[PDB]
Amino acid sequence: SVVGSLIFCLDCGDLLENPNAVLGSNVECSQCKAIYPKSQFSNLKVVTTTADDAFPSSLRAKKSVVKTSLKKNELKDGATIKEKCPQCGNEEMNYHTLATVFYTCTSCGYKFRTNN
Amino acid sequence: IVMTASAAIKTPQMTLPIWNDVSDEQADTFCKSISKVLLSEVIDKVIVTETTAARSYVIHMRFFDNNEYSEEYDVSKEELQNVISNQFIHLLEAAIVKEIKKQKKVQRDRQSAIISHHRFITKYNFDDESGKWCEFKLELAADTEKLLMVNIVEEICRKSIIRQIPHIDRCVHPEPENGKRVLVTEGVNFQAMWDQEAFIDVDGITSNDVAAVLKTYGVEAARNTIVNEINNVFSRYAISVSFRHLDLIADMMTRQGTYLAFNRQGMETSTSSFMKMSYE
Amino acid sequence: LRLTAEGNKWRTDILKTSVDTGREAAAEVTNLDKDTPADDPELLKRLQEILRDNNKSGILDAVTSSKVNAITSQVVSKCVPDGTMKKFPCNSMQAMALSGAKGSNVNVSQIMCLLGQQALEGRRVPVMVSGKTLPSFKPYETDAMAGGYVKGRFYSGIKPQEYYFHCMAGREGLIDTAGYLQRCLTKQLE
Amino acid sequence: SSRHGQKGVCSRKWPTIDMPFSETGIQPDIIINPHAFPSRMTIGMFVESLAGKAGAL
Amino acid sequence: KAQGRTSGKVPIPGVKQALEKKEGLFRKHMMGKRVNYAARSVISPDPNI
Amino acid sequence: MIVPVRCFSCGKVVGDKWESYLNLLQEDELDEGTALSRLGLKRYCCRRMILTHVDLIEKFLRYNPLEKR
Amino acid sequence: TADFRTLERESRFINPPKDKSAFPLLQEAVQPHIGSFNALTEGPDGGLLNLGVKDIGEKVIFDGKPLNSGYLGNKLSVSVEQVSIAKPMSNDGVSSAVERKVYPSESRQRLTSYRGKLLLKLKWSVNNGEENLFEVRDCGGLPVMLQSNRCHLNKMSPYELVQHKEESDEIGGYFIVNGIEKLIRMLIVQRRNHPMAIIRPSFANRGASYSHYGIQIRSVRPDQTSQTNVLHYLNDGQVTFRFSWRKNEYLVPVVMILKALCHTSDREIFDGIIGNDVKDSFLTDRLELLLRGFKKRYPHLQNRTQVLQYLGDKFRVVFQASPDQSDLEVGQEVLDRIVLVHLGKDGSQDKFRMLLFMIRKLYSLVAGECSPDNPDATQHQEVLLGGFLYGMILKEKIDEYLQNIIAQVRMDINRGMAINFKDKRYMSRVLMRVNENIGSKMQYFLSTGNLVSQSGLDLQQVSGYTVVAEKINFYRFISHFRMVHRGSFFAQLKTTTVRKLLPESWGFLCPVHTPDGSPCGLLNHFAHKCRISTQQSDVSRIPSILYSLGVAPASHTFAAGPSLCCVQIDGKIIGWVSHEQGKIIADTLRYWKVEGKTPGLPIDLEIGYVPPSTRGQYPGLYLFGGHSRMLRPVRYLPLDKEDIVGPFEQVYMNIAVTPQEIQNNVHTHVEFTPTNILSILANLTPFSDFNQSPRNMYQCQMGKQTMGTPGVALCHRSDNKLYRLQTGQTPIVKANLYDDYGMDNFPNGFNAVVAVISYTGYDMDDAMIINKSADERGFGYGT
Amino acid sequence: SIPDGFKKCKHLKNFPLNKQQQVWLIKFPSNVDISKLKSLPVTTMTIDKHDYKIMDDTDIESSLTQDNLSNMTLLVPSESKESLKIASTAKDNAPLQFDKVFSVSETAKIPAIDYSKVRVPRKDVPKVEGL
Amino acid sequence: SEIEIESVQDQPSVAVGSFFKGFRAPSDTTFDLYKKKKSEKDEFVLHGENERLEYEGYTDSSSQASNQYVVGLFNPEKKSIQLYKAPVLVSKVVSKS
Ligand SMILES: [Zn+2]
Ligand SMILES: [Zn+2]
Ligand SMILES: [Zn+2]
């Protein structure tokens, strides 16, 4: 019968129609023809909640328990190697590869790449 | 740049230098101000309740702590009130009609106006102290078959515009490269920015929007930007090129004082014919 | 390509300390105490939570990425050239790189000091939805090696896990390797 | 080519009196430029070379 | 501009279709050409020249 | 295929020893080292010629159209 | 260490084995093709071919004679009873002088196709078997695979092969057409009978109603022909069923299907999805909206039959059902020809059970409770074997032929021809007017590789299925068989991720050996230890065992939701248990399958337990004995024994590679040898582990381009173009796997002295130097 | 429409219905002679020296937290012993629900993983003797 | 812990039917049980009838090969229980309408 805003005939397994949709004062199965009093049930309510992801925001991050954010110094990319900066003469430049070898100055941030 | 002479590039960015007197905080503060805000951002949770003499809907919205987003997104609950008080509602009952059609003290006074202007609103309420929540009731015809409220509403708040800017999306504060103090933005409006002068010098503003520069500032300055950008490409790739090539390329597309790609269009004006013949 | 005895003796020492590196990187990101043992459920939970986010995952890596890089910058700095059996100029491998004839310290360094942490398009190895990098690893492990940190060198040989990783990194540029513009320019500019 | 993936191209068929020769007086069959390795970084090729002499002796 | 024939058999090349062929007759046979007095072969290094 | 004549580098004639060499491992059942030593091949330059040889010519002989099997 | 074993290989070369090869691994290396081709006629079924044509049944037409009262004409029953293929045999010219064995040797030198004839038992029946007639009709010589049962050479010892003038160790296992060696390369497809969850943008692209969410399952009949079912979640909350037919899609209200299956009640319908889960409104909200929509759109159908009555009406001509056939029958056809056909016709109630299960899980996807299944992850994939595909194509051609029988008769009828079903001459009169020769068409397929049918067979391309066998060297030759790809359709895809290496393919595909260039990442090779499931193992006694384990019958027990462990077998739902109860069980099974003392327990069987997790993969327990399952050995831990592992079920297992890696309460399994993850060419290169991978890749291709030893059949071999090394040597340094295949038979190269030095300055730019004399002394002789 | 071979169950035996009494459903292996037992626990049990396991499968047949969610309905002999009525107790004709459902099923004792035989030290690659 | 077995009935006494959750039938409704002796296994069929509904039920051929079912009456003011053998029938309710 009554489950989660829905009601079924106790004879068959049919969903009983909405009493508010029902014009008369009683509800009868269109199939097994079991009549039911309308007033036997009325005025159900349903409460729901939204999903937790439905509205992403920055506050989500600050509500999260882990680090989603980045400062400036963590941005160090790759191990450092001794490299003469052809711009500023710095002795250290960070690098990455492809054998195509990047270079990035530690001091002036100057870059160049080396394929050879 | 060269091939399209695109009117709208995917990622135009206005480059905003600032006065020196301003601190980082103030800019950071200011960055939030001009920044774009959205309802979906400030919503803690939504809880809607439906009941069935008619088909009714009680709608409870939960926000975060007022101060927080008021600090975070620089928000006055009054707008937050007014925004819903105006645009949110107007949108809200609107689609539901289409949805249905598809199927085939002062608060009490404040509550009075909205209910009047808008059919299905039987109640309005809001948290006027903590701002922690807004909550209100709606009703529909009894015979009306079920609608899914959450998703309909879910769609809305993401379309909300608590406080947008004239063709301005997000401003971001990068690091002070080369002793330069600048803000980075998406979207391009010069006029709107012309009011922020207290924070920012105007004359150092640059963008990729070059057409709009040409639109606003004319051809010459625009040309200068053209070189800058193109260089920055190779620059990132650490590839040196004589500006003479660039200027040649630059002065070339400007000979009409307009912004000319190299394509059927840019070629079209050619007095020389056969060159247009063998091309396409 | 041989170190002296001490060079390896060195090469051990720094590599030894690398043990708990990964775990520590996690606790900070998770906002947990540095000494949180890797077996903490909450810790393990947050990881799975983290594992669910694309972003947080990439966020995790760079943090781990940062620390291990410093490791790398130690073995090589100490062993080349000071720990080499033959020195420049007699050492032809060094002389070629030094004189820029061919190759850079990167080659020799990585083939002698170690290959360090792998990187895939600015990331670590994508994890099987099991939460395991590799069937040889229990889920949610803290080891950087468990995340593709290569402690081997082409000289001394590499473990299969280690090896299987590098195969991916190899597969990058190939896939990556897999005028019409300029033609337009020239034509109009004759 | 070798089994180490070194591809090479013939250049000069080299008259043998010119071929530098071992202490044992043996004219090498095929000469390679060491400058390939530090690029390609294939070490086992060096290694295989060793055993080759090791086993055969 | 022509009505198709018997749904198949392909359109026979017309003079219009003859002009733009591949890169176009300008590009294919004019902007580039087969030539005489020339050869193609592999090269090999020598320092001695 | 079939036993070559000469050590490619040494040029020294390697051919005849083959049959005798097979015999060595066959009857004498010795190592290869003393065997080739007994064959007197000092330079490995020559040793490489014997040790890796294949009699592969053989399996060809199994197909003769010149005779009905 | 290692041994040259010269004296051994010598007498071997001298004395070809008169019993069997010494290189089993070599044989097994190709085995799937043989296996794939074998069971076509084989197996207690009487061969797949019999099952399929059995599943094809009859076609019937009515002569429309008045007969002298509605009467649509006499009933002609046309049915193919049986299929038969004789080994390749040739009479001498005509007159059927006694046929003689045609050895593939001649077939090449004739520039021909080595072919046995195909024959059928054709029953000609009338008026509900009021009359029936038989004949056997020659189908023509059908192409046939080497080393088949149908191949005369089968089982023959090497020595006999010499007598038959073929290669000593010859593996064969392919086709010869116009004297050209062709074979069918393997394809990878999704799993048999499995309910995957998908997110693809193309979904909403189908129509605005649709999300990007959907459930897909690919079902395969016992004949191994497949049928695929797809669900799109409508943005309004409805879910419409989707199939295609004749390459044409149709959409259906799912409820209508639901009630059509068995006579059922809405609570049953409800209680299936929700079960104990009633508290979620999100579910109820959806489920209600479902039924109400079905209501009032079809308030007139309250009856299972009434529905079916309605259904056969719609699609009758789509299935071209004969006029006699009531739409009720026509509807009965539809459920039979379409839905979950892997379960057969009579499993309706269980089909009903399964069909629910998806919907339940469909929402959990929509609810996002459960993470989506990566489609192209190795986890959900399998191989479509050639031999299986072979008859499928045949199956089509049998059918279309049989249809063509009707056309003549109809044209006969429509012409007003004087006709009797019962004149076998008239019967024969029809036959002479119809092409019966498929073997030509089959050849034409084998010739062109072109896939031509009214049925795309859920396949992505029209051609490229064949390949040209290459003896160019030996290694290129053997390579073909272990080589497989994703289909050319994925090549055009710009998305690169398809080419990623994944931790799943560990132990299976070769990370090392892959093509480079445009094919790179698409074409891929197995590890050499890999196996393929060629059979259907018996699961019959499994359910019995399950109940003994405390499993509740899915029949009368009402549960749903991931909350507790679901249990299935090969697309059949057994019952329900808690997760905590499930994994313990999966252990016992695994414990027994190793133990192997319990009957009903083939060790090939996959145990698919997925622990529950937080938004991980959807939990459950999965059992697979099905065909086409990548399977590879793993050493256990306890009763130290070999074990078989599917890549799917692998995911969660804790595998130790080496005994020194072992940690307590960690690994349940260890690899026999780490080498096992690699492949043959991967195993060949010495000490590759010291060499940077892009080389190892590059190398693997080089060997396949080398000038090798093609084979000993040269004298009799008619092949178009070949290259012959004059003289090879045995590479000194080497891996035991070499002898294990004993490539000594086929030397690809030679040992030489090389010095690493800078001398002439020519060696620059990797150019290599040749001592000029050794050339004159014959070094590196070729032809 | 009686099928072939079935005869109507004529004389139905008696079923004494009613801290009060409880009605249970229990599954035994079909090979077990139930007619000769004694014990029963409220874990593990042995029947005829062979050992089984008793599981409380009540939450599968019904809900533990909510009423009226029972899969099964009990049918008892009616006032004639020639037919069956739905068993009730509620003086409301509300069908009886099983108080408990038990599954007596087979169990397989598992041993330990002989780590002595199985976790063996690595051996070095063997030196070739007599070089 | 420990439970004593008062009696065990071997003969048809009661039956068990799974229809669906919350299932009931009108007061009058009455069910006829039927039994066949196939091998050393007992098969059962159920047929019930009321004014506007039919009820049918069968024993699952597959489960009855390895599952035996028994209804128990429990006396907790005692360590005693009374077991009766019962078939479990898979059953439906059909509307005569
Ligand atoms: Zn009812
Ligand atoms: Zn620099
Ligand atoms: Zn020599």
Swiss-Prot record, chain B:
It is found in: Nucleus, Nucleolus. Belongs to the RNA polymerase beta' chain family. Present with 2840 molecules/cell in log phase SD medium. Component of the RNA polymerase I (Pol I) complex consisting of 14 subunits: RPA135, RPA190, RPC40, RPA14, RPB5, RPO26, RPA43, RPB8, RPA12, RPB10, RPC19, RPC10, RPA49 and RPA34. The complex is composed of a horseshoe-shaped core containing ten subunits (RPA135, RPA190, RPB5, RPO26, RPB8, RPB10, RPC10, RPA12, RPC19 and RPC40) where RPA135 and RPA190 form the DNA-binding cleft. Outside of the core, RPA14 and RPA43 form the stalk that mediates interactions with transcription initiation factors and newly synthesized RNA. DNA-dependent RNA polymerases catalyze the transcription of DNA into RNA using the four ribonucleoside triphosphates as substrates. Component of RNA polymerase I (Pol I) which synthesizes ribosomal RNA precursors. Besides, RNA polymerase I has intrinsic RNA cleavage activity. RPA190 and RPA135 both contribute to the polymerase catalytic activity and together form the Pol I active center. In addition, subunit RPA12 contributes a catalytic zinc ribbon that is required for RNA cleavage by Pol I. This is DNA-directed RNA polymerase I subunit RPA190. The gene is RPA190. The chain holds residues 1225 to 1616 of 1664 of the full protein.
UniProtKB/Swiss-Prot annotation, chain D:
Three distinct zinc-containing RNA polymerases are found in eukaryotic nuclei: polymerase I for the ribosomal RNA precursor, polymerase II for the mRNA precursor, and polymerase III for 5S and tRNA genes. Present with 14100 molecules/cell in log phase SD medium. It is found in: Nucleus, Nucleolus. The gene is RPA135. Belongs to the RNA polymerase beta chain family. Component of the RNA polymerase I (Pol I) complex consisting of 14 subunits: RPA135, RPA190, RPC40, RPA14, RPB5, RPO26, RPA43, RPB8, RPA12, RPB10, RPC19, RPC10, RPA49 and RPA34. The complex is composed of a horseshoe-shaped core containing ten subunits (RPA135, RPA190, RPB5, RPO26, RPB8, RPB10, RPC10, RPA12, RPC19 and RPC40) where RPA135 and RPA190 form the DNA-binding cleft. Outside of the core, RPA14 and RPA43 form the stalk that mediates interactions with transcription initiation factors and newly synthesized RNA. The chain holds residues 918 to 974 of 1203 of the full protein. Disulfide bonds: none annotated. This is DNA-directed RNA polymerase I subunit RPA135. It comes from the Eukaryota.
Curated annotation (Swiss-Prot), chain F:
Keywords: DNA-directed RNA polymerase, Isopeptide bond, Metal-binding, Nucleus, Ribosome biogenesis, Transcription, Ubl conjugation, Zinc. Belongs to the archaeal Rpo10/eukaryotic RPB10 RNA polymerase subunit family. PROSITE patterns: RNA_POL_N_8KD (PS01112). PANTHER family: DNA-DIRECTED RNA POLYMERASES I, II, AND III SUBUNIT RPABC5 (PTHR23431:SF3), DNA-DIRECTED RNA POLYMERASES I, II, AND III SUBUNIT RPABC5 FAMILY MEMBER (PTHR23431). The lineage of its organism: Eukaryota, Fungi, Dikarya, Ascomycota, Saccharomycotina. Zn(2+) binds at C7, C10, C45, C46. InterPro entries: RNA_pol_su_RPB10 (IPR023580), RNA_pol_suN_Zn-BS (IPR020789), RPABC5/Rpb10 (IPR000268). One of its GO terms (molecular function) is DNA-directed RNA polymerase activity. Component of the RNA polymerase I (Pol I), RNA polymerase II (Pol II) and RNA polymerase III (Pol III) complexes. Component of the RNA polymerase I (Pol I) complex consisting of 14 subunits: RPA135, RPA190, RPC40, RPA14, RPB5, RPO26, RPA43, RPB8, RPA12, RPB10, RPC19, RPC10, RPA49 and RPA34. The complex is composed of a horseshoe-shaped core containing ten subunits (RPA135, RPA190, RPB5, RPO26, RPB8, RPB10, RPC10, RPA12, RPC19 and RPC40) where RPA135 and RPA190 form the DNA-binding cleft. This is DNA-directed RNA polymerases I, II, and III subunit RPABC5. The gene is RPB10. Present with 5300 molecules/cell in log phase SD medium. HAMAP family: RNApol_arch_Rpo10 (MF_00250). The keyword Ubl conjugation applies. There is a cross-link at K59 (Glycyl lysine isopeptide (Lys-Gly) (interchain with G-Cter in ubiquitin)). It is found in: Nucleus, Nucleolus.
From Swiss-Prot, chain I:
Belongs to the eukaryotic RPA49/POLR1E RNA polymerase subunit family. The chain holds residues 8 to 104 of 415 of the full protein. The gene is RPA49. It comes from the Eukaryota. DNA-dependent RNA polymerases catalyze the transcription of DNA into RNA using the four ribonucleoside triphosphates as substrates. Component of RNA polymerase I (Pol I) which synthesizes ribosomal RNA precursors. Besides, RNA polymerase I has intrinsic RNA cleavage activity. The heterodimer formed by RPA34 and RPA49 stimulates transcript elongation by Pol I. Subunit RPA49 can bind both single-stranded and double-stranded DNA. The modification Phosphoserine is found at S27. This is DNA-directed RNA polymerase I subunit RPA49. Signal peptide: none annotated. Component of the RNA polymerase I (Pol I) complex consisting of 14 subunits: RPA135, RPA190, RPC40, RPA14, RPB5, RPO26, RPA43, RPB8, RPA12, RPB10, RPC19, RPC10, RPA49 and RPA34. The complex is composed of a horseshoe-shaped core containing ten subunits (RPA135, RPA190, RPB5, RPO26, RPB8, RPB10, RPC10, RPA12, RPC19 and RPC40) where RPA135 and RPA190 form the DNA-binding cleft. Outside of the core, RPA14 and RPA43 form the stalk that mediates interactions with transcription initiation factors and newly synthesized RNA. It is found in: Nucleus, Nucleolus.
